[PDB]
Write a protein that binds this DNA or RNA. Structure first.
Ligand code: ADP
Lengths: 96, 80, 96, 442, 109, 97, 85, 109, 96
DNA sequence: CCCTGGAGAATCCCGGTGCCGAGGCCGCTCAATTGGTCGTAGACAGCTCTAGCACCGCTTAAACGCACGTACGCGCTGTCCCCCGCGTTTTAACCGCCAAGGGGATTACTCCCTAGTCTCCAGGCACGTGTCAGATATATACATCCTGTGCA
DNA sequence: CACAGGATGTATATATCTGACACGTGCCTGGAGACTAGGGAGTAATCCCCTTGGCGGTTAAAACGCGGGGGACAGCGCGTACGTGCGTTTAAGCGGTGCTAGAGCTGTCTACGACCAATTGAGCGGCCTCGGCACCGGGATTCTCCAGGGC
């Protein structure tokens, strides 16, 4: 019984099946997707942390995440991602 | 507000080129330099305005400019 | 009618401007340009004098470095005259 | 079948091969797969050709038969097949990609042959094609090649759909019982499917007797004066002692401590910096700095004033190079048989050393070079510079000169050193050799 | 009694681990405190980026007449799109190759 | 009489072939020997996993490919078709290396 | 006393291999002095990366260099690599 | 009672604030915990770098026949040193100017 | 009153008086030096944070600082800085 | 002829002006000192497995060396037009000053959000396993490049 | 100079084979539900500072025009270094031996070093003041560049 390593592979596969119903992905491509998700996560988290430090705040919030997204992503991606995050936050708040 | 880029004059561009260390300047290079300056300024001001709006302020600060330049990879010493 | 050969005055200007340290663009036109560019991203933006000074410093440094690379490209092409093709080559090799 | 058959041509068989043929026929009648351990020099290929000819002629079953041989014996086997039993139809698979495709399309796929003789590499290359044929008999020569499982050749040869199987190995037991179990698992997968004095020995003999046939090269020739062995101990030189202590502690990067102690017992110059400076001289530095070389330097002149014709077997070609330098210094006559010697050069060197009248005095061989060939009859003295983990390798080295063509007793001088890795190497080899004797010789 | 467990991903309609994102943010030393909606926002952004890159990669794979996605398809999708190329301008994809691009001067004429 | 292609058709054909493929164009064992030799200077008694050598080879090949692309751009700038050490040096100078 | 040397390991990066790399880069004609320059630049790049990777491995108090150490060194140099971690 | 206060800066023979560096490390969200030797080591490194730069700038200012140091002197010192230039290779110093360097082909024949 | 502002100015001045006894500094140069000190502090601290995360440890120690200095500073600067830090830590251990 | 003279620009040496750096005081907040705790990390022990060193045998793709010819780099030459140096006129930057008011910075209060705990249990991870997508080989069919030949 | 044909390279169906991917199962550990405590941040109020708008006068800098020489660019010729193809050689790649330790990985134990809290006193930041260094201007030198022996 090896130790547990956590990867985003399951969720990447769910997204892939939602986008293209009948397609696959190899192990190397899944490794690349996991690395891409980790890199983007680290970029956004670090930018939000620096925003919180600059404004002299101790809490990372949805405002900080939105500002970090607009600072990192280039334009059309930025606006679409901002809309998606706002939709998810509204659904989470109105649901439970 | 228009034609403000033409406020960046040919003598000023020539002075910048002389500090860079160039001798002969083609006549078509002034508009190209204006475009380069425009895109650079647009990127920096966009990031600075993002920081200013996050701070809920209406005034752009030298610290906002420095943070923008730092995240673009152009650290500036002398303003905070 | 004393007259200098075409290129000695340019070298004198090169030397003096490389020894000097002041800004080489007019402050009021630069400030008007900065405000006009900021007109697109948000209305009624006020600027500290330090902010415009720092923007001018960064812009001049960037342009001087670009001109140095452009001069290198022109000398590589066996020319003494810098051209828009030289500027474009410098941008492409830098990664812009 | 107490008498030699009739399908054999070009001479009649003898008692030992006729008895081997009887044993193999009984094995086929009982439907068992087995091992011939007749030892090199008794006619295993002759017996196998006899068995295949018998199965073709007396039994009306001309079928797809395969013989797996090392590439170095393909031509000898084909010549024997044509000579002894010209009745059979034999086809060989060797060559480049285009030659292999041409051969398979022309002869193999149409299917007008009886025996297919292929090498191990050609079996690995053409496994997909070879797996089609409804294989009847599978004779694997040098069965100790597949003695290890988890190996690609072993699994490929197991995956064939075969009916009758046979192994031809002179050393069924090399180190331990795992490899013997692997060979027996290839023979009869169901009988042995796990892991192999009154608790042992007797049970092993009663299990193995219906599956193994072995006769030593002593009940047929009554010749070949008996082997003589001298185990000569060697004192460590002073530089060897210093490097031994240094390596015992731990700039030279040393990864395998055992593999450093081993050459350190051979010669310090094999390292970097133990050799003297730039002058690159070759005058008595080699002899004095190595105790084994001092002993050998004393030993060689006596044999040379006597029978001479000495063979030196070593496990390191660097040590072979040092011995070449020594031979040039002493102006002896040397021949180098190494793993880097091309095939044509080997045969010419062997023939030159085995001429009726030669001036050659030293033949140097790597302990694992060549393999199951190499005729060296003029020799009388065998020197084992290094001892190996597997004692059967040294047994093969010392029977390369101890063959039917010899007339004088072979004196095997084995160099060992006190309180070194050589002691434990020789102890391990002796344990393995005693296990081999107690298991196989009965 | 004890209400049934409903995942925050299901609450926000996401296919990404909101709880794992929250734990990573808390354990990564980015701030002392983390908001409730920040992990949801970040998970949604990651989901959108994954969807974009995977859509382009699937288009490329169908264009090459294959069902499985390979790093060559990923590199082809990352290039040929300006926004993703800017986002991943300094990233090397293993077993990705380069784009087909021959300078018009080199073309014979 | 024997057929022969003009000097430059095979070059374009190879350009297309290697821009279609994805495998590594440097030999594995020579690259591994180079990596070990370089590591011996920085520290002795160093062992390398197989994945580390593969990662180094991928990164090195990518760097060399990008360098050659910028070098070709500089050569085209000089109204040439051949690439030269001058082009390599100019590319490195502008990139900042 | 018998020893010999084969070749320098930088020469193992062969001229045809450099030609293939230039083909992927999109190069038609290549000078004869390019190979020395390419060997030099590759050696510099490898030296920097391997030094950083060895620093990481020494910090972790290991004697084996790992793909993760290589990835960290590349990310420090600004050459993020996807696929090995 | 308590003994006289002794700063860790003096206890380590330094001129930079060890306690201030410790507080900045604690409040910077760099880790959960901070060792005792880390502030001392970091203060020593910072002091070494500052002293090196200041010595170079003072030599430059003396070559300019001035007492006070200005950004031009700082830029000259930084760009005239290979290692400091590499350290500050992506940094712009305000009111620094550029080094005097004219290409040889542009000089008069 | 205006909130207090921290800077390294007094310590930079002490170092300057130590190295060049009779050389002064200006306000712009002091701003530049303060920015430089903050920048180097941030770089080293971030490198040590990443090292601590890579090795999965909760403490930043002198080993982390030394490794980060070896990573960031080039060559002779790294060697001399490592020596100075080792000396300071030895003095602190002995004299405490 | 290259060397001489004229002319402009750069440099060096003195003398009056101003503002900025250096010093000297006061308060307050932040760092130092003790005491107490616990959890991280050092230290140890057991296990397993990949890495390493020195070899053998074999196949075969790739490197290496060689000779030919051909585009291509490189120098030279001529043309002309574009860029530069200089004088003149004009426009707007620069500086100083004044006036007003938006907005940045600080403070106090309260509440609402989040950290931390403890159950509880379902999602995610490791382990086996079998079938299909892709890799390979092979024989056609098609597109491409190169040369010769009536054009000359 | 524009086709015809030849020889070669390349895309195309098609059949085979394999090994990795997608799936199922069991378990376990980290995430969700319910809950309490506390302090960070939102909100409102106030103060003063620093940004913006406007005006007048100076003057340096920009715009414009002109005249002319030097640089860019095209064309041409050459002799030379590199691509192309071919015949030989070599080492990479693959498959095996033969060992031991070795180094990484996981599970326990315990101690010492970092956090937390209260208290307190110097160190540091901010506020004033003042003289000396930088600066500005002025005047006598020395270097350099451009005609002219085509001085
Ligand atoms: N038919 C034979 N009868 C007797 N001795 C033989 C025969 N064939 C070969 N030998 C001897 O046996 C030695 C090697 O035999 P080997 O090659 O094992 O025979 P096979 O190839 O039939 O197994 C040779 O030196 C030769 O002298």
């Amino acid at each position: 019984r090896k130790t547990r390593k956590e990867s985003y592979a399951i969720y990447v596969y769910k997204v892939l099946k939602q986008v293209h119903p009948d397609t696959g992905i190899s192990s190397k491509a899944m490794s690349i997707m996991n690395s891409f998700v980790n890199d983007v996560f680290e970029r956004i988290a670090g930018e939000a942390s620096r925003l919180a430090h600059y404004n002299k705040r101790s809490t990372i919030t949805s405002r900080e995440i939105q500002t970090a997204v607009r600072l990192l992503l280039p334009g059309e991606l930025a606006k679409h991602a901002v809309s998606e995050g706002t939709k998810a936050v509204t659904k989470y708040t109105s649901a439970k | 507000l228009r034609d403000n880029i033409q406020g960046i004059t040919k003598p000023a561009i020539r002075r910048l080129a002389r500090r860079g260390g160039v001798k002969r300047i083609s006549g078509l290079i002034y508009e190209e330099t204006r475009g380069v300056l425009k895109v650079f300024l647009e990127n920096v001001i966009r990031d600075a305005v993002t920081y200013t709006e996050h701070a809920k302020r209406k005034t752009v600060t030298a610290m906002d400019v420095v943070y923008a330049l730092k995240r673009q990879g152009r650290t500036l010493y002398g303003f905070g | 009618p004393h007259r200098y050969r075409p290129g000695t005055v340019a070298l004198r200007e090169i030397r003096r401007y490389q020894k000097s340290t002041e800004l080489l663009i007019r402050k009021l036109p630069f400030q008007r340009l900065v405000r006009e560019i900021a007109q697109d991203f948000k209305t009624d933006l006020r600027f500290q004098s330090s902010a415009v000074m720092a923007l001018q410093e960064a812009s001049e440094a960037y342009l001087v470095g670009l001109f140095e690379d452009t001069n290198l490209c022109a000398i590589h092409a066996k020319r003494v005259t810098i051209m828009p093709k030289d500027i474009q080559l410098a941008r492409r090799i830098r990664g812009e | 079948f107490e008498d030699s058959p009739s399908y054999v041509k070009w001479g009649k068989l003898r008692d030992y091969q006729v008895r081997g043929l009887n044993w193999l026929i009984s094995l086929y009648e009982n439907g068992i797969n087995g091992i011939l351990a007749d030892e090199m020099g008794l006619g295993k290929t002759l017996q196998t050709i006899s068995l295949l000819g018998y199965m073709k002629h007396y039994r009306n079953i001309p079928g797809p038969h395969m013989v797996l041989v090392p590439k170095s014996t393909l031509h000898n086997w084909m010549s024997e097949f044509k000579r002894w039993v010209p009745t059979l139809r034999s086809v060989c698979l060797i060559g480049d990609k285009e030659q292999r495709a041409a051969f398979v399309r022309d002869v193999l796929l149409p299917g007008e042959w009886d025996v297919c003789v292929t090498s191990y590499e050609m079996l690995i290359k053409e496994k997909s094609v070879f797996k089609k044929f409804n294989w009847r008999y599978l004779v694997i020569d040098e069965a100790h090649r597949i003695k290890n499982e988890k190996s690609k050749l072993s699994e490929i040869v197991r995956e064939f759909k075969t009916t009758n199987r046979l192994l031809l190995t002179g050393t069924p037991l090399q180190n331990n019982l795992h490899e013997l179990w692997s060979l027996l698992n290839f023979l009869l997968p169901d009988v042995f499917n796990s892991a192999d004095d009154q608790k042992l020995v007797e049970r092993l003999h009663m299990v193995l007797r219906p599956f193994l046939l072995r006769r030593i090269k002593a009940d047929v020739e009554k010749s070949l004066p008996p082997k003589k062995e001298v185990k000569i101990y060697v004192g460590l030189s002073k530089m060897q002692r210093e490097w031994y202590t240094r390596i015992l502690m731990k700039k030279m990067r040393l990864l395998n401590i055992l593999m450093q102690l081993r050459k350190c017992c051979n010669h310090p110059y094999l390292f970097d910096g133990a050799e003297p400076g730039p002058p690159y001289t070759t005058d008595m530095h080699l002899v004095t700095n190595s105790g084994k070389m001092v002993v050998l330097d004393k030993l060689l002149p006596k044999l040379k004033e006597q029978g001479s014709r000495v063979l030196i077997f070593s496990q390191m070609t660097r040590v072979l190079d040092i011995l070449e330098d020594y031979c040039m210094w002493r102006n002896y006559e040397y021949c180098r048989l190494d793993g880097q010697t091309p095939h044509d050069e080997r045969q010419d060197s062997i023939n030159a050393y085995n001429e009726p009248n030669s001036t050659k005095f030293v033949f140097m061989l790597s302990t694992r070079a060549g393999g199951l060939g190499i005729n060296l009859a003029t020799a009388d003295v065998v020197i084992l510079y290094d001892s190996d983990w597997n004692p059967q390798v040294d047994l093969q080295a010392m029977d390369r000169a101890h063959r039917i063509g010899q007339t004088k007793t072979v004196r095997v001088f084995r160099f060992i050193t006190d309180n070194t890795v050589e002691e434990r190497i020789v102890e391990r080899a002796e344990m393995k050799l005693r296990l081999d004797s107690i298991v196989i010789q009965q | 009694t004890r209400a049934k467990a409903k995942t925050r991903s299901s609450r926000a309609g996401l296919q990404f681990p909101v709880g794992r994102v929250h734990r990573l943010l808390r354990k990564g030393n980015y701030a002392e405190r983390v908001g409730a909606g920040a992990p949801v926002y970040l998970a949604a952004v990651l989901e959108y980026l994954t969807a974009e890159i995977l859509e382009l990669a699937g288009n490329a794979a169908r264009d090459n007449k294959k069902t499985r996605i390979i790093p060559r398809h990923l590199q082809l999708a990352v290039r040929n799109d300006e926004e993703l190329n800017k986002l991943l301008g300094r990233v090397t994809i293993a077993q990705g190759g380069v784009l087909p691009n021959i300078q018009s001067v080199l073309l014979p004429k």
